[PDB]
């Protein structure tokens, strides 16, 4: 399958209550592997997956240094942006940044991204060419000019195409037992009487990884996506995911309904049928 | 591994 490494950064100002809150997290696919929290005791980048723990102090030092540079830039940005938008010093504001890279099943680069938001609204983003910038408004256009003069796009491109891919592959290798596994959903179907003429079939997929899945109901082979209740895919807390899909059927016509499950961990898609 | 050069990327 394809794989990705993604970093997420959030800075929240807290006027009169000290320095902004800053939280960073890194993922490989749907597995978190590092974090930093400005308010935690360590003031260090910290491991959140077993396989990253074998990296030595040089790495923990380097990541801590870089992550603090992220925080410091966002801290200055919160001041810059308040000024650009004529906002007072009293209110709390947010800066978010996300970047990372995808590789294909052959572990060659597919694409990179780098996006930035202020107060939850797009502000500036690198285009897919890893050369051009999308600016949301006139403030971000001034940022764009600054970033052009500093060759920011060239710096990020070399990172996304080079460093990001190298380290994603290294982590895939080191954490192969967990990251390159697929856990196929454990599936089952419950039946609940609504009344004496209808019942709810609910189709469950549990303990699966990665998070991507498709659950659909059919009736005599016809799709039913107007009459299916879905839940959003949700974390189980143990590294796996959950999802369900339900339909309200006439009682005694249960046999006409089939649940179809698509997941990377399945030889072949599943058809389930009540009983 | 995190990107370098964030000091050079102020808004």
């Amino acid at each position, epitope marked *: 399958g394809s794989h990705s490494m993604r970093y997420f950064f959030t800075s929240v100002s807290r006027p009169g209550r000290g320095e902004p809150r800053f939280i960073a997290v890194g993922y490989v696919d749907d597995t978190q592997f590092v974090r930093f929290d400005s308010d935690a005791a360590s003031q260090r980048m910290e491991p959140r997956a077993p396989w990253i723990e*074998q*990296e*030595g102090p*040089e*790495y923990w030092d*380097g990541e801590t*240094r870089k992550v603090k*540079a992220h925080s410091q830039t966002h801290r200055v940005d919160l001041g810059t942006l308040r000024g650009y938008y004529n906002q007072s010093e009293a209110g709390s504001h947010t800066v978010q940044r996300m970047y990372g890279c995808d590789v294909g099943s052959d572990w060659r680069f597919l694409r990179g991204y780098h996006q930035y938001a202020y107060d939850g609204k797009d502000y500036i983003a690198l285009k897919e060419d890893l050369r051009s910038w999308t600016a949301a408004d006139m403030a971000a256009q001034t940022t764009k000019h600054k970033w052009e003069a*500093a*060759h920011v796009a*060239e*710096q990020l491109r*070399a*990172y996304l*195409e*080079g*460093t990001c*891919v*190298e*380290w994603l*592959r*290294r982590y895939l*290798e080191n954490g192969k037992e967990t990251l390159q596994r697929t856990d196929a959903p454990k599936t089952h179907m419950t039946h609940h009487a609504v009344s004496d003429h209808e019942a709810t079939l609910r189709c469950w997929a549990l303990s699966f990884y990665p998070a991507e899945i498709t659950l659909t109901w059919q009736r005599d082979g016809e799709d039913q996506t107007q009459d299916t209740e879905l839940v959003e895919t949700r974390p189980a807390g143990d590294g796996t995911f959950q999802k369900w899909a339900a339909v309200v059927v006439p009682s005694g016509q249960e046999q006409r309904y089939t649940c179809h499950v698509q997941h990377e961990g399945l030889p072949k898609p599943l058809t389930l049928r009540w009983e | *591994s995190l*990107a*370098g*050069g964030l*000091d*050079d990327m102020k808004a």
Partner: T-cell receptor
Amino acid sequence: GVTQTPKFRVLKTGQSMTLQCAQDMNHNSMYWYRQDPGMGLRLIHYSRWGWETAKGEVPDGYNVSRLKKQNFLLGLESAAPSQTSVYFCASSYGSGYNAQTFGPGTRLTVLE
Amino acid sequence: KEVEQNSGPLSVPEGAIASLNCTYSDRGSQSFFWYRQYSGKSPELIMSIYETSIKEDGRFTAQLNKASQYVSLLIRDSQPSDSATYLCAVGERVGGYNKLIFGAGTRLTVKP
């Protein structure tokens, strides 16, 4: 840090040898350089663990092998007087960790 | 050249300030280093710097200016034991920050 064996070697023209570089620093990137008066450090070949080795500025006459993360071997198959130099191995954590730690150096003298 | 340093050799009386400068061509460079190499020994990393700033370590001051693309090294109260070749090194952006480009080096002699 980085160790190199041997420290010194005399070869007759035409003989072969392998220089070994080892490190215990968890480094993924390893490099082999030669240093001669008037030219400074010149990269022969380098290696990123998980990738094919890459030629440097002066690869001709040398081969390399990266059988494991810890070890980077430089091979001279047919020693020539031009290969009389001081060879330095170096290691770095990987991409974006560009600080290199250098081994103590290997002096090779090739004689008729 | 991508990394350029004071040609040298450089002679300084004991007690004086030794001034070393390095210019680099890539505005996207991120990692900058100063190495010291004693005669017959291997290069040793003595300073690293990553932001426009001044960084002090004892008698050594490194200063980076990313906007003007230079990095400098000052040695205050120069000592004879500082006599060595000093090398500027920059992580190469092109290729994915995977190696160092080194300047030609400045031979410093501190006269007792």
